[PDB]
Design an enzyme around this catalytic site. Structure first.
Site, PDB file in Angstrom:
ATOM      1  N   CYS A 107      64.369 -40.017  47.571  1.00  0.00           N
ATOM      2  CA  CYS A 107      62.636 -41.530  47.700  1.00  0.00           C
ATOM      3  C   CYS A 107      63.531 -42.723  48.808  1.00  0.00           C
ATOM      4  CB  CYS A 107      62.992 -41.447  46.516  1.00  0.00           C
ATOM      5  SG  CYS A 107      64.930 -41.637  45.216  1.00  0.00           S
ATOM      6  N   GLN A 115      68.412 -49.459  43.858  1.00  0.00           N
ATOM      7  CA  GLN A 115      67.815 -48.171  42.962  1.00  0.00           C
ATOM      8  C   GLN A 115      67.693 -48.221  42.275  1.00  0.00           C
ATOM      9  OE1 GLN A 115      70.048 -45.577  46.756  1.00  0.00           O
ATOM     10  NE2 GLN A 115      68.780 -44.387  45.831  1.00  0.00           N
ATOM     11  N   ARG A 127      72.820 -48.016  42.740  1.00  0.00           N
ATOM     12  CA  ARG A 127      71.895 -48.349  41.132  1.00  0.00           C
ATOM     13  C   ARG A 127      72.205 -49.565  40.209  1.00  0.00           C
ATOM     14  NH1 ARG A 127      68.626 -44.299  40.855  1.00  0.00           N
ATOM     15  NH2 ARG A 127      70.162 -43.030  40.669  1.00  0.00           N
ATOM     16  N   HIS A 150      62.480 -48.987  44.427  1.00  0.00           N
ATOM     17  CA  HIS A 150      63.618 -49.249  45.604  1.00  0.00           C
ATOM     18  C   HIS A 150      63.683 -50.268  46.419  1.00  0.00           C
ATOM     19  CE1 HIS A 150      65.058 -45.709  43.478  1.00  0.00           C
ATOM     20  NE2 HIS A 150      65.017 -44.948  44.760  1.00  0.00           N
TER      21      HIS A 150
END
Lengths: 369, 369
Positions: free
Chosen positions: B134, B161, B267, B274
């Protein structure tokens, strides 16, 4: 020593008061409490009587002080400081605000990094001592060992900054936004058979709605991020981004040959810890072991975390760091670009080392000299 | 063309289904829906009857297909793909999973960047096409204009993310955690005169409590962050950080002289977009206006966001981008290190360009050829 306190009731000031009590700083001074709202009534009693609240704007009253510690902010400093110095006051001005940081008569204070500079200033007639930008102070608490050895060629800093940097109202708004997001889908969230895309649809709609609480941030923070902090400067930096280079180099005494520091400062949905992801270019190829030792042995608060998944997830986060004086740094490794490129990730409490702690430490240093 | 759909009921699968309906992809194929736990149950009706749900592990049923699009994941591919190929199946395997990405027989598909590579593969017997990570796909959708011109010397990427990247339950968990945080202090927030430090203390205790819902992440995400994604590798990178360098250089056909890409993947508490903060070292001092033009003209979805405060806050965020095919890139400026250092901040939807969109687009390219 007679020490005036201004802005002691605000967020940063309240952290400072807590820390001064914890370290028994009040045992060593005659504290005089000032107010910008109401005077003549009893001052706070943090262990001993301190008389009445005094007028924070009264020049004659301030002139009787040996020192001022102010967490009241830039507006207050701008209003009072010039007049106070013009009136002949030669006492110590210890300030959390950015106002005087780059003043020729001020020293930016972060003693684990620049004690020598602070002491030289005290001995040679410097009377104004200013805490640095939160991200700058937290970065140098993490990386002081490298910077003090002149090993940093340049550093790119991509930040993950907490709501507390913007203020108490911003922190409250962040939590309120979190509540509003959950409220939108709470009925169906815990049902695994419910459509995840329907849940997301409602969350996105709620966050975009006019009723979403964004008075302070202007846009959503919870569930999102904001890659701009503070006013624009002519070169395209935000003021937050620009502060790092000018302040760190003043602290380090390198203004004649500064370390280039730049990057993007981003607000994220954390309460009071700033995190920073750093690309550090070193002037030499230093073994990782030696870098680890240099970093770890610089000060009592930096904590070098093993480069491992589980320990990183547990130790290198705002959840771990919040409300503590610890400054963990991890993910320390050489990068694909070469053995002179060092990756680092660090987390620090914005209200302690990033605000209140250097102020009380500066007071203690002045007292001991 | 008989096309099998695997993992269509999951999150990435659901997005794929929505996109295939929106673009009327089902009009062009004969869809055969596969299942693990609902074999024999009527297949979904997205416009036309598709019969019954077939067995996703039966090689003989899969062998009757001209193509498979699978969002099922790595463990499914590992088990089915080798057995299916060994059975003599010559059909097109279109896969979201990381499993086959670096296999010599497979092409990583991101057609706004590598259409030519994909077409050459199709015409020369390539039957395996795999969506990239991604973060890699989103980065290249933003910066394709620079990479395709070979102007990048190296790039450091610090990521922000979204929870969706870890899975649907992880996104639910993020929202759950937000609710729990707000619940703990909702009374205090409703009182204008409550102490921010009291609120802060309760939020921190709540996040650290055994009652805090952390089953999926293992630690808090709401109010925090996690600077480690995926398994550790020997050189100190996480797998997530290592993917960018191997995948991007494969997409760009630069295996013989790869661009060094590295950084820390983090994260954060974002829903499904993102964001990436990039330090891009250029091989030349290209004028900023020309850089913006190179970026903007690369593809239909990239969006150059002017480097101004208000517009950045409004446009360059997950809250703006979520659920759209837009890939904004902003904060474009030369950095303090020099005019061959370019700062970029980009945001992209994890489930669209980062997952489902390259899969349906690859199907359409194969159909047209």
């Amino acid at each position: 020593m007679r020490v005036g306190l201004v802005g002691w009731r605000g967020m940063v000031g309240s952290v400072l008061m807590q820390r001064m009590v914890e370290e028994r700083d009040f045992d060593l001074i005659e504290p005089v409490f000032f107010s910008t709202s109401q005077i003549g009534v009893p001052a706070p009693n943090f262990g001993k009587d301190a008389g009445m609240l005094h007028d924070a704007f009264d020049i004659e009253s301030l002139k009787q002080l040996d020192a001022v510690i102010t967490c009241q902010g830039g507006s207050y400093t701008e209003k009072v400081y010039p007049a106070l110095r013009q009136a002949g006051w030669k006492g110590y001005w210890i300030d959390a605000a950015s106002t005087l940081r780059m003043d020729k008569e001020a020293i930016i204070t972060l003693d684990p990094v620049n004690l020598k500079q602070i002491l030289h200033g005290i001995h040679h007639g410097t009377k104004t001592f200013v805490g640095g930008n939160c991200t700058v102070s937290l970065m140098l608490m993490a990386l002081g060992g490298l910077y003090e050895r002149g090993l940093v060629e340049w550093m790119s800093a991509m930040t993950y900054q907490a709501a507390s940097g913007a203020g108490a109202q911003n922190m409250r708004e962040l939590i309120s936004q979190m509540g509003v997001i959950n409220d939108a889908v709470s009925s169906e969230l815990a049902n695994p058979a419910s459509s995840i895309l329907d849940i997301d649809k409602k969350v996105a709609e709620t966050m975009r709605s006019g009723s979403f609480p964004t008075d302070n941030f202007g846009v959503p923070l919870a569930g999102s991020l904001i890659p701009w902090i503070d006013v624009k400067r002519d070169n395209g930096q935000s003021k937050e981004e620009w502060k790092a280079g000018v302040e760190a180099n003043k602290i380090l005494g390198l203004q004649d040959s500064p370390v280039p520091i730049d990057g993007t400062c981003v607000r994220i949905g954390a309460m009071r810890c700033h995190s920073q992801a750093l690309t550090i270019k070193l002037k030499q190829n230093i073994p990782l072991d030696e870098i680890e030792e240099m970093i770890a042995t610089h000060n009592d608060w930096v904590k070098v975390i093993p480069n491992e998944r589980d320990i990183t997830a547990r130790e290198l986060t705002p959840a771990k760091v919040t409300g503590t004086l610890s400054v963990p740094v991890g993910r320390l490794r050489k990068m694909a670009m070469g053995d002179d490129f060092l990756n680092a990730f660090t987390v620090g409490d914005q209200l302690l080392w990033g605000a209140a702690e250097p102020l009380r430490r500066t007071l203690r240093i002045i007292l001991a000299e």
